[PDB]
Each structure stands twice: as C-alpha cells, then as structure tokens.
Amino acid sequence: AFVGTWKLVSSENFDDYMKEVGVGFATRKVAGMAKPNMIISVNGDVITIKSESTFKNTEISFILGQEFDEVTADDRKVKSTITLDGGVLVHVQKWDGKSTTIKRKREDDKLVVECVMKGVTSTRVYERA
Ligand SMILES: O=C(O)[C@H]1CCCN(c2ccc([N+](=O)[O-])c3nonc23)C1
Numbered sequence: 679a680f681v682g683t684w685k686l687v688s689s690e691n692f693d694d695y696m697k698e699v700g701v702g703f704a705t706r707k708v709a710g711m712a713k714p715n716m717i718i719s720v721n722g723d724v725i726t727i728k729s730e731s732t733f734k735n736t737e738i739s740f741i742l743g744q745e746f747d748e749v750t751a752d753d754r755k756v757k758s759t760i761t762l763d764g765g766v767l768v769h770v771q772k773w774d775g776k777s778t779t780i781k782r783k784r785e786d787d788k789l790v791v792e793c794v795m796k797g798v799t800s801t802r803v804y805e806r807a
Pocket residue numbers: 695696699701705706709716729733734750751752780791793802
C-alpha cells in the first residue's frame with residue numbers, strides 16, 4: 679500500500695513544524711522550498727524510505743517495532759521507532775527528552791504525512807510519480 683515513488687504535491691505548516699523541532703532559518707528556507715520524492719520499498723522484514731531532494735537526500739531502513747539510530751535531514755541524532763497501527767506507519771523520534779511523531783497513511787490516491795511537534799501539526803501530501 680506504501681510501496682512506490684511519491685512526489686510532494688502540498689504542504690501545510692511545515693516551516694512552523696521545523697521551527698518547533700529546532701531547525702535553523704537557513705535549513706528551513708531550503709527544506710521548505712524543496713519538493714522531495716519519497717521512495718518506499720520493502721524486502722522481507724526491512725522497509726526502506728528514501729527522500730530525494732535538491733536540498734538533501736535521506737534514507738532510513740528499519741524493522742517494525744525495532745528502535746534504530748537515525749540522522750535526520752536537519753542533522754538531529756534521534757532514536758526512532760516505527761510501527762504499523764491500523765494501516766498507519768507511526769514513526770516516533772526521541773532526542774534530548776523531546777519527541778516528534780510522523781504518521782504516514784494512505785488516503786485515496788494520496789500518501790499523507792502528518793508531522794507533530796508540541797502544538798504544531800504539519801500535513802504533507804504526496805501523490806504517485
Ligand atoms: O518526509 C517529509 O515530508 C517530512 C517528514 C518530517 C521530517 N522531514 C523533514 C525534512 C527535512 C527537514 N529539514 O530540516 O531539512 C526536517 N526537519 O524536521 N523534519 C524535517 C520530512
């Protein structure tokens with residue numbers, strides 16, 4: 679359901695989200711005008727999510743319910759746990775007593791990414807490439 683190549687088509691509140699996470703202005707400026715592709719693949723237990731953009735490429739590979747070390751696009755060193763809850767991929771990142779949740783869900787033709795940090799929610803919609 680998640681496997682594919684996905685292109686960003688809309689975004690709400692992403693600058694506020696990155697500011698709440700603690701991302702500096704210059705990174706927010708280039709990350710916000712980026713229009714990434716998200717490439718999701720699976721082989722057995724291992725899910726890979728790639729983000730490709732002219733700002734930064736990133737990749738995570740993980741097993742559901744197995745905490746892993748992640749370096750984010752903004753260079754945060756986080757402890758990440760991804761689970762699959764009612765069709766939703768729920769990704770929690772924990773660092774310095776803080777946390778952020780990124781939910782990836784399939785709604786109609788879209789892949790919806792909901793990013794929560796404290797009182798800020800950002801919603802990013804992707805469509806198949
Ligand atoms: O995949 C998506 O659409 C977004 C999900 C939430 C995490 N994403 C982010 C991207 C980039 C930067 N950055 O600062 O360059 C972030 N900083 O915080 N979060 C960031 C991508």
